Amino acid sequence: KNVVIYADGVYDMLHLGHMKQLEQAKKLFENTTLIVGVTSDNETKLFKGQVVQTLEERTETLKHIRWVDEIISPCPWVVTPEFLEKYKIDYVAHDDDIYAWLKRAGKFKATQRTEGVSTTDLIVRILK
Amino acid sequence: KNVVIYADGVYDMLHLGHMKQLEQAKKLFENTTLIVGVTSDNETKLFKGQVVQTLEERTETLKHIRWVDEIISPCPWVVTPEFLEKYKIDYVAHDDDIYAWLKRAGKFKATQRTEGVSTTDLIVRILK
Ligand SMILES: C[N+](C)(C)CCOP(=O)(O)O
Ligand SMILES: C[N+](C)(C)CCOP(=O)(O)O
């Protein structure tokens, strides 16, 4: 009955947008375990760009979020079939092609972003 | 057995500091209900100063925090004996004199801040 959901991300300067996506992932089925993967500082820099918070900071903040049952920190940059078997993951939840193989397997669940609520957008707000 | 704890605050741009205080309040006893009071936009401005986020935004973010069982939004600026009876509150938890009457009654539990982890401190970090 219990369904294992995996959501990965940088989770830099966690904001309501991230929180809503985690909520959505958690609530995909009636009984879930939400595992959250937090990306390493080096791979995030190499593959994405600037990260403000350290892995420790990003991970520690996620611990306080209601929807998070387990954290993998650091997580792999790229999800593999071996990773899913290792952690007994039933679905991967992410914003929506590197996820084609997951969709082909029936193991992909889309979740939605929220614009405007960003931590950086809040500073853009204040300046006046 | 279940102990009702009340923590109030502005909770503007919620950060690890706030989250740790809420955790501390929640864990004061083995079985607790943590009620969190979120201050109104006008009273925060009048009595404290600038608030970046609206009451709705501050309240919505707190909903996602593991330790929060109930929210009173807006909450009164000043705690009263009548308020404690109304919500069946056993202890008030806050950083540590407007709380003298609570300490005299045995209804005050100190919780600690964390400096450096602030949302604004993180912007102070990045600029370089
Ligand atoms: C590649 N990755 C999925 C592990 C990290 C990027 O995820 P995200 O922060 O864009 O949601
Ligand atoms: C007066 N008050 C306690 C309701 C709001 C101020 O609380 P805080 O944000 O300084 O912890």
Side-chain angles (χ1 to χ4, degrees), chain A residues 1-29 31-49 51-128, chain B residues 1-29 31-49 51-128:
Chain A
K1 188 60 170 293
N2 198 83
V3 179
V4 181
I5 305 297
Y6 181 69
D8 63 12
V10 183
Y11 303 107
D12 201 18
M13 292 178 302
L14 199 76
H15 54 77
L16 184 64
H18 291 113
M19 291 168 202
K20 288 168 74 175
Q21 271 192 280
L22 295 169
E23 185 187 9
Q24 188 177 4
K26 173 69 180 168
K27 290 178 171 167
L28 288 169
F29 300 88
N31 294 312
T32 65
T33 300
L34 180 61
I35 304 174
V36 180
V38 191
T39 55
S40 73
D41 283 315
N42 291 352
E43 291 168 308
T44 304
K45 287 167 175 172
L46 179 48
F47 295 116
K48 247 198 165 56
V51 69
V52 179
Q53 296 180 297
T54 65
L55 180 59
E56 190 174 339
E57 290 166 337
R58 293 180 287 115
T59 300
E60 198 170 340
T61 304
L62 277 165
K63 176 181 75 173
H64 294 95
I65 303 306
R66 192 189 298 286
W67 321 111
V68 177
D69 301 309
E70 310 187 1
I71 301 177
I72 298 168
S73 178
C75 67
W77 189 260
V78 180
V79 178
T80 67
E82 290 73 24
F83 182 84
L84 305 182
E85 179 57 47
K86 182 176 177 169
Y87 294 98
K88 307 293 177 282
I89 294 160
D90 298 300
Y91 306 84
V92 176
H94 212 255
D95 56 305
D96 193 23
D97 187 11
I98 52 160
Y99 303 125
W101 72 273
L102 284 156
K103 291 172 193 178
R104 220 147 47 231
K107 296 183 185 303
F108 187 77
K109 290 302 208 178
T111 60
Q112 286 75 56
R113 297 183 182 176
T114 308
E115 174 57 25
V117 299
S118 150
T119 184
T120 51
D121 301 6
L122 294 177
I123 303 149
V124 169
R125 168 190 302 181
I126 101 93
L127 283 173
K128 232 63 163 290
Chain B
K1 188 60 170 293
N2 198 83
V3 179
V4 181
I5 305 297
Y6 181 69
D8 63 12
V10 183
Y11 303 107
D12 201 18
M13 292 178 302
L14 199 76
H15 54 77
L16 184 64
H18 291 113
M19 291 168 202
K20 288 168 74 175
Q21 271 192 280
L22 295 169
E23 185 187 9
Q24 188 177 4
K26 173 69 180 168
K27 290 178 171 167
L28 288 169
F29 300 88
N31 294 312
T32 65
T33 300
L34 180 61
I35 304 174
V36 180
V38 191
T39 55
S40 73
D41 283 315
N42 291 352
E43 291 168 308
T44 304
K45 287 167 175 172
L46 179 48
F47 295 116
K48 247 198 165 56
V51 69
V52 179
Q53 296 180 297
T54 65
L55 180 59
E56 190 174 339
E57 290 166 337
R58 293 180 287 115
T59 300
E60 198 170 340
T61 304
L62 277 165
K63 176 181 75 173
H64 294 95
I65 303 306
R66 192 189 298 286
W67 321 111
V68 177
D69 301 309
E70 310 187 1
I71 301 177
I72 298 168
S73 178
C75 67
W77 189 260
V78 180
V79 178
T80 67
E82 290 73 24
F83 182 84
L84 305 182
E85 179 57 47
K86 182 176 177 169
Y87 294 98
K88 307 293 177 282
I89 294 160
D90 298 300
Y91 306 84
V92 176
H94 212 255
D95 56 305
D96 193 23
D97 187 11
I98 52 160
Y99 303 125
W101 72 273
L102 284 156
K103 291 172 193 178
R104 220 147 47 231
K107 296 183 185 303
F108 187 77
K109 290 302 208 178
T111 60
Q112 286 75 56
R113 297 183 182 176
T114 308
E115 174 57 25
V117 299
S118 150
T119 184
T120 51
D121 301 6
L122 294 177
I123 303 149
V124 169
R125 168 190 302 181
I126 101 93
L127 283 173
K128 232 63 163 290

mmCIF file of all heavy atoms in Angstrom, chain A residues 8-11 18 21 39 48 75-78 94-95 98-99 113, ligand 1:
data_model
loop_
_atom_site.group_PDB
_atom_site.id
_atom_site.type_symbol
_atom_site.label_atom_id
_atom_site.label_comp_id
_atom_site.label_asym_id
_atom_site.label_seq_id
_atom_site.Cartn_x
_atom_site.Cartn_y
_atom_site.Cartn_z
ATOM 1 N N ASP A 8 14.021 15.033 -6.475
ATOM 2 C CA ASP A 8 15.369 15.562 -6.298
ATOM 3 C C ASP A 8 15.411 17.019 -6.693
ATOM 4 O O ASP A 8 14.503 17.534 -7.347
ATOM 5 C CB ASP A 8 16.442 14.729 -7.016
ATOM 6 C CG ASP A 8 16.295 14.702 -8.534
ATOM 7 O OD1 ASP A 8 15.510 15.485 -9.112
ATOM 8 O OD2 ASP A 8 16.995 13.872 -9.157
ATOM 9 N N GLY A 9 16.462 17.686 -6.263
ATOM 10 C CA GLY A 9 16.591 19.093 -6.536
ATOM 11 C C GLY A 9 17.754 19.699 -5.813
ATOM 12 O O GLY A 9 18.450 19.044 -5.044
ATOM 13 N N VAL A 10 17.957 20.974 -6.076
ATOM 14 C CA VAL A 10 18.994 21.730 -5.416
ATOM 15 C C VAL A 10 18.471 22.191 -4.061
ATOM 16 O O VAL A 10 19.195 22.143 -3.078
ATOM 17 C CB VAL A 10 19.445 22.949 -6.256
ATOM 18 C CG1 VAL A 10 20.581 23.669 -5.549
ATOM 19 C CG2 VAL A 10 19.897 22.506 -7.646
ATOM 20 N N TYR A 11 17.226 22.662 -4.030
ATOM 21 C CA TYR A 11 16.614 23.198 -2.806
ATOM 22 C C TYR A 11 17.444 24.333 -2.197
ATOM 23 O O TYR A 11 17.632 24.418 -0.981
ATOM 24 C CB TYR A 11 16.331 22.051 -1.807
ATOM 25 C CG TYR A 11 15.446 20.994 -2.421
ATOM 26 C CD1 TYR A 11 15.953 19.752 -2.791
ATOM 27 C CD2 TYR A 11 14.085 21.238 -2.653
ATOM 28 C CE1 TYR A 11 15.145 18.793 -3.362
ATOM 29 C CE2 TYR A 11 13.272 20.271 -3.225
ATOM 30 C CZ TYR A 11 13.817 19.049 -3.585
ATOM 31 O OH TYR A 11 13.039 18.058 -4.152
ATOM 32 N N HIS A 18 9.122 25.546 -3.621
ATOM 33 C CA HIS A 18 9.679 24.214 -3.336
ATOM 34 C C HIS A 18 8.742 23.444 -2.414
ATOM 35 O O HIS A 18 8.484 22.261 -2.616
ATOM 36 C CB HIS A 18 11.020 24.317 -2.625
ATOM 37 C CG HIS A 18 12.127 24.859 -3.468
ATOM 38 N ND1 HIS A 18 12.721 26.075 -3.224
ATOM 39 C CD2 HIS A 18 12.787 24.327 -4.521
ATOM 40 C CE1 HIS A 18 13.682 26.283 -4.103
ATOM 41 N NE2 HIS A 18 13.743 25.237 -4.903
ATOM 42 N N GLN A 21 5.714 22.007 -4.178
ATOM 43 C CA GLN A 21 6.095 20.837 -4.981
ATOM 44 C C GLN A 21 6.290 19.589 -4.139
ATOM 45 O O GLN A 21 5.892 18.508 -4.554
ATOM 46 C CB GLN A 21 7.383 21.080 -5.741
ATOM 47 C CG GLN A 21 7.191 21.690 -7.095
ATOM 48 C CD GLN A 21 8.469 21.635 -7.899
ATOM 49 O OE1 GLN A 21 9.357 22.460 -7.703
ATOM 50 N NE2 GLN A 21 8.577 20.649 -8.791
ATOM 51 N N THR A 39 21.118 17.795 -4.246
ATOM 52 C CA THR A 39 22.272 17.692 -5.136
ATOM 53 C C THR A 39 23.546 18.272 -4.491
ATOM 54 O O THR A 39 23.495 19.225 -3.705
ATOM 55 C CB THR A 39 22.011 18.395 -6.476
ATOM 56 O OG1 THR A 39 21.632 19.754 -6.233
ATOM 57 C CG2 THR A 39 20.911 17.685 -7.253
ATOM 58 N N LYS A 48 24.562 23.337 -13.368
ATOM 59 C CA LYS A 48 23.480 24.340 -13.290
ATOM 60 C C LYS A 48 23.984 25.770 -13.204
ATOM 61 O O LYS A 48 23.689 26.583 -14.075
ATOM 62 C CB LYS A 48 22.512 24.042 -12.124
ATOM 63 C CG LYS A 48 21.113 23.652 -12.586
ATOM 64 C CD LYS A 48 20.072 23.776 -11.484
ATOM 65 C CE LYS A 48 18.660 23.746 -12.048
ATOM 66 N NZ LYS A 48 18.380 22.532 -12.874
ATOM 67 N N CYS A 75 22.639 13.515 -3.301
ATOM 68 C CA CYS A 75 22.018 12.552 -4.197
ATOM 69 C C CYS A 75 22.790 12.522 -5.521
ATOM 70 O O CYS A 75 23.534 13.448 -5.828
ATOM 71 C CB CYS A 75 20.551 12.904 -4.452
ATOM 72 S SG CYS A 75 20.314 14.430 -5.368
ATOM 73 N N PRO A 76 22.606 11.466 -6.322
ATOM 74 C CA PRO A 76 23.200 11.502 -7.673
ATOM 75 C C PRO A 76 22.569 12.571 -8.548
ATOM 76 O O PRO A 76 21.372 12.873 -8.400
ATOM 77 C CB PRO A 76 22.871 10.120 -8.243
ATOM 78 C CG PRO A 76 22.666 9.262 -7.049
ATOM 79 C CD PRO A 76 22.020 10.152 -6.020
ATOM 80 N N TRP A 77 23.367 13.144 -9.443
ATOM 81 C CA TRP A 77 22.874 14.132 -10.381
ATOM 82 C C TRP A 77 21.833 13.527 -11.341
ATOM 83 O O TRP A 77 20.838 14.167 -11.652
ATOM 84 C CB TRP A 77 24.024 14.780 -11.171
ATOM 85 C CG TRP A 77 23.515 15.937 -11.951
ATOM 86 C CD1 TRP A 77 23.200 15.959 -13.282
ATOM 87 C CD2 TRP A 77 23.173 17.224 -11.432
ATOM 88 N NE1 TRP A 77 22.708 17.196 -13.629
ATOM 89 C CE2 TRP A 77 22.684 17.992 -12.510
ATOM 90 C CE3 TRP A 77 23.256 17.811 -10.161
ATOM 91 C CZ2 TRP A 77 22.272 19.321 -12.356
ATOM 92 C CZ3 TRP A 77 22.838 19.124 -10.002
ATOM 93 C CH2 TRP A 77 22.353 19.869 -11.099
ATOM 94 N N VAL A 78 22.061 12.291 -11.784
ATOM 95 C CA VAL A 78 21.195 11.630 -12.752
ATOM 96 C C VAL A 78 20.615 10.374 -12.122
ATOM 97 O O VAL A 78 21.355 9.528 -11.611
ATOM 98 C CB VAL A 78 21.961 11.245 -14.055
ATOM 99 C CG1 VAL A 78 21.030 10.558 -15.052
ATOM 100 C CG2 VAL A 78 22.581 12.480 -14.699
ATOM 101 N N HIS A 94 8.857 15.197 -10.474
ATOM 102 C CA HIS A 94 9.662 16.353 -10.860
ATOM 103 C C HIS A 94 8.859 17.248 -11.768
ATOM 104 O O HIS A 94 7.832 16.837 -12.324
ATOM 105 C CB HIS A 94 10.970 15.914 -11.545
ATOM 106 C CG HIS A 94 12.137 16.831 -11.301
ATOM 107 N ND1 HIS A 94 12.617 17.698 -12.260
ATOM 108 C CD2 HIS A 94 12.932 17.001 -10.213
ATOM 109 C CE1 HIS A 94 13.651 18.363 -11.773
ATOM 110 N NE2 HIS A 94 13.862 17.958 -10.532
ATOM 111 N N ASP A 95 9.306 18.493 -11.869
ATOM 112 C CA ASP A 95 8.726 19.425 -12.830
ATOM 113 C C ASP A 95 9.065 18.945 -14.245
ATOM 114 O O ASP A 95 10.109 18.312 -14.468
ATOM 115 C CB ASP A 95 9.172 20.876 -12.568
ATOM 116 C CG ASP A 95 10.678 21.041 -12.562
ATOM 117 O OD1 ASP A 95 11.349 20.325 -11.795
ATOM 118 O OD2 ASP A 95 11.189 21.895 -13.312
ATOM 119 N N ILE A 98 15.318 14.041 -20.348
ATOM 120 C CA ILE A 98 15.991 13.090 -19.437
ATOM 121 C C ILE A 98 15.041 12.186 -18.616
ATOM 122 O O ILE A 98 15.479 11.178 -18.065
ATOM 123 C CB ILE A 98 17.002 13.791 -18.491
ATOM 124 C CG1 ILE A 98 16.366 14.977 -17.747
ATOM 125 C CG2 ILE A 98 18.218 14.250 -19.282
ATOM 126 C CD1 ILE A 98 17.117 15.387 -16.499
ATOM 127 N N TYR A 99 13.758 12.554 -18.536
ATOM 128 C CA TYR A 99 12.732 11.749 -17.861
ATOM 129 C C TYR A 99 11.914 10.832 -18.785
ATOM 130 O O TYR A 99 11.007 10.160 -18.317
ATOM 131 C CB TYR A 99 11.790 12.676 -17.074
ATOM 132 C CG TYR A 99 12.515 13.542 -16.065
ATOM 133 C CD1 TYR A 99 12.385 14.939 -16.077
ATOM 134 C CD2 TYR A 99 13.340 12.968 -15.097
ATOM 135 C CE1 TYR A 99 13.063 15.732 -15.155
ATOM 136 C CE2 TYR A 99 14.021 13.751 -14.172
ATOM 137 C CZ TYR A 99 13.884 15.131 -14.206
ATOM 138 O OH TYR A 99 14.566 15.885 -13.283
ATOM 139 N N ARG A 113 5.839 23.942 -10.694
ATOM 140 C CA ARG A 113 6.499 25.071 -10.033
ATOM 141 C C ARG A 113 5.506 26.173 -9.700
ATOM 142 O O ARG A 113 4.360 26.164 -10.166
ATOM 143 C CB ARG A 113 7.577 25.667 -10.927
ATOM 144 C CG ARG A 113 8.712 24.730 -11.263
ATOM 145 C CD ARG A 113 9.731 25.475 -12.100
ATOM 146 N NE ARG A 113 10.846 24.625 -12.496
ATOM 147 C CZ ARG A 113 11.845 25.004 -13.294
ATOM 148 N NH1 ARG A 113 11.895 26.237 -13.801
ATOM 149 N NH2 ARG A 113 12.807 24.138 -13.590
HETATM 150 C C1 LIG C 1 19.483 17.113 -12.164
HETATM 151 N N1 LIG C 1 18.723 17.117 -10.875
HETATM 152 C C2 LIG C 1 17.309 16.751 -11.189
HETATM 153 C C3 LIG C 1 19.305 16.105 -9.939
HETATM 154 C C4 LIG C 1 18.851 18.440 -10.172
HETATM 155 C C5 LIG C 1 18.072 19.557 -10.821
HETATM 156 O O1 LIG C 1 16.818 19.538 -10.184
HETATM 157 P P1 LIG C 1 16.027 20.899 -9.853
HETATM 158 O O2 LIG C 1 16.620 21.660 -8.716
HETATM 159 O O3 LIG C 1 16.059 21.737 -11.248
HETATM 160 O O4 LIG C 1 14.457 20.492 -9.593
#
